[PDB]
Design an enzyme around this catalytic site. Structure first.
Site, PDB file in Angstrom:
ATOM      1  N   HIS A   1       9.050  -1.416   0.414  1.00  0.00           N
ATOM      2  CA  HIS A   1       9.133  -2.857   0.614  1.00  0.00           C
ATOM      3  C   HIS A   1      10.566  -3.368   0.824  1.00  0.00           C
ATOM      4  O   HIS A   1      11.113  -4.136   0.015  1.00  0.00           O
ATOM      5  CB  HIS A   1       8.433  -3.571  -0.540  1.00  0.00           C
ATOM      6  CG  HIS A   1       6.948  -3.371  -0.541  1.00  0.00           C
ATOM      7  ND1 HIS A   1       6.316  -2.474  -1.372  1.00  0.00           N
ATOM      8  CD2 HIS A   1       5.976  -3.927   0.224  1.00  0.00           C
ATOM      9  CE1 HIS A   1       5.019  -2.493  -1.129  1.00  0.00           C
ATOM     10  NE2 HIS A   1       4.785  -3.371  -0.171  1.00  0.00           N
TER      11      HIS A   1
ATOM     12  N   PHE B   1      -7.985   5.482   1.760  1.00  0.00           N
ATOM     13  CA  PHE B   1      -7.339   4.224   2.100  1.00  0.00           C
ATOM     14  C   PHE B   1      -7.554   3.879   3.568  1.00  0.00           C
ATOM     15  O   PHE B   1      -7.641   2.708   3.937  1.00  0.00           O
ATOM     16  CB  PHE B   1      -5.846   4.290   1.756  1.00  0.00           C
ATOM     17  CG  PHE B   1      -5.091   3.042   2.103  1.00  0.00           C
ATOM     18  CD1 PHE B   1      -5.323   1.864   1.415  1.00  0.00           C
ATOM     19  CD2 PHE B   1      -4.145   3.051   3.112  1.00  0.00           C
ATOM     20  CE1 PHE B   1      -4.629   0.717   1.736  1.00  0.00           C
ATOM     21  CE2 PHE B   1      -3.443   1.916   3.425  1.00  0.00           C
ATOM     22  CZ  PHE B   1      -3.688   0.744   2.740  1.00  0.00           C
TER      23      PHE B   1
END
Ligand code: JN7
Ligand code: ZN
Ligand code: ZN
Length: 327
Positions: free
Chosen positions: A77, A289
């Site tokens: 991030h 996922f």
């Protein structure tokens, strides 16, 4: 004129309109300014500076302030993830099925929402922030903590010296842009995923098209849901990238997750869902996922803009089988 480094940089940037730009090279060539250089490139490319009368030094000053409020000590991030989502959002806006659909203001708002969407991210999760009883969590009452924070910070940054890139927009432009930017960024929160994905499906179900190949979106709800889905698609576009990139991204998010797992051990806290250093299989986590979140999302989007997302869906499907190979 250019240094030879700038020249190498410029040639890589000649791919800003292509999926799978080498964002990691760009970060190196740019002195860790991938966000600044990709945004600037996109803004000139899309003529955003003239259309909104943004002085270029102000644009640069703000871009650089924005990028420095991403954390260099955070594996996923960070500013490079920021730049990646911005450029992906940029490519998705150019998709033929949205030719001439969105106004400059809406384009501006989607690109800008991408750029600030994770700013000042600490590298741990909302639940972590709530469990540690962190200040941030108290401010935002445990509700979309990080995502509320990214917005507050992205906007506050416009007040720093020579940073207001919206100084020439009318009040009307500013209020509409702001609301758009807030709806887009709050929708990046993963806990909105199903709801967001459901509306997209309903959009595809009842999908209309008129006068040449172009989607019919004639009210706010519909227009904003698309933009929201677009950016959320860009936030989750790593497994649709060429594997060389995808694998580098998987490395980074796994580093972030285990490091949070570590911080959870170092505090007796219980362990996060497969943040388990020592005990969690990356290859499996990637596959589920994809099958459960990433493929359904992108399958719907492909539907919406059929068939401009075909190679994208295909790459994802390959990268998925490749992760299976790894048992
Ligand atoms: C069922 C809902 O779960 C859920 O949404 N979360 C758990 C897993 C996960 C995210 S975001 C993300 N990754 C991305 O936002 C971008 C990517 C970076 C590299 C590949 S994809 C992963 C993940 O990719 O991995 C996790 C699955 C289980 C272990 C970690 C949030
Ligand atoms: Zn986020
Ligand atoms: Zn993100």
């Amino acid at each position: 004129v250019k240094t030879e480094q700038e020249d190498v940089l410029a040639k890589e940037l000649e791919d800003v309109n292509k999926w799978g730009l080498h964002v990691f090279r760009i970060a190196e060539l740019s002195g860790n300014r991938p966000l600044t250089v990709i945004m600037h490139t996109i803004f000139q490319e899309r003529d955003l500076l003239k259309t909104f009368k943004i002085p270029v030094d102000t644009l640069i000053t703000y871009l650089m302030t924005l990028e420095d409020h991403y954390h260099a000590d955070v594996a996923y991030h960070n500013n490079i993830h920021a730049a990646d989502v911005v450029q992906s959002t940029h490519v998705l806006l150019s998709t033929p099925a949205l030719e001439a659909v969105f106004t400059d203001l809406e384009i501006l708002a989607a690109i800008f929402a991408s750029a600030i969407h994770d700013v000042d991210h600490p590298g741990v999760s909302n639940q972590f922030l709530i469990n540690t009883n962190s200040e941030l969590a108290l401010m935002y009452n445990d509700s979309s903590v990080l995502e509320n924070h990214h917005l507050a910070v992205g906007f506050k940054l416009l007040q720093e010296e020579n940073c207001d890139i919206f100084q020439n927009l009318t009040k009307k432009q500013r209020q509409s842009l702001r609301k758009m930017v807030i709806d887009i960024v709050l929708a990046t929160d993963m806990s909105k995923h199903m709801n967001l994905l459901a509306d997209l499906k309903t959009m595809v179900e009842t999908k209309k098209v008129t006068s040449s190949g172009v989607l019919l979106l004639d009210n706010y709800s519909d227009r904003i849901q698309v933009l929201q889905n677009m950016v959320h698609c860009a936030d989750l576009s790593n497994p649709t990238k060429p594997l060389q990139l995808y694998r580098q991204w998987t490395d980074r998010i796994m580093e972030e997750f285990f490091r949070q797992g570590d911080r959870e051990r170092e505090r007796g806290m219980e362990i996060s869902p497969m943040c388990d250093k020592h005990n969690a299989s990356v290859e499996k986590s990637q596959v589920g996922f994809i099958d459960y979140i990433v493929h359904p999302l992108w399958e719907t989007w492909a539907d919406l803009v059929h068939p401009d997302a075909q190679d994208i869906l295909d790459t994802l499907e390959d990268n998925r089988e490749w992760y299976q190979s790894t048992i």
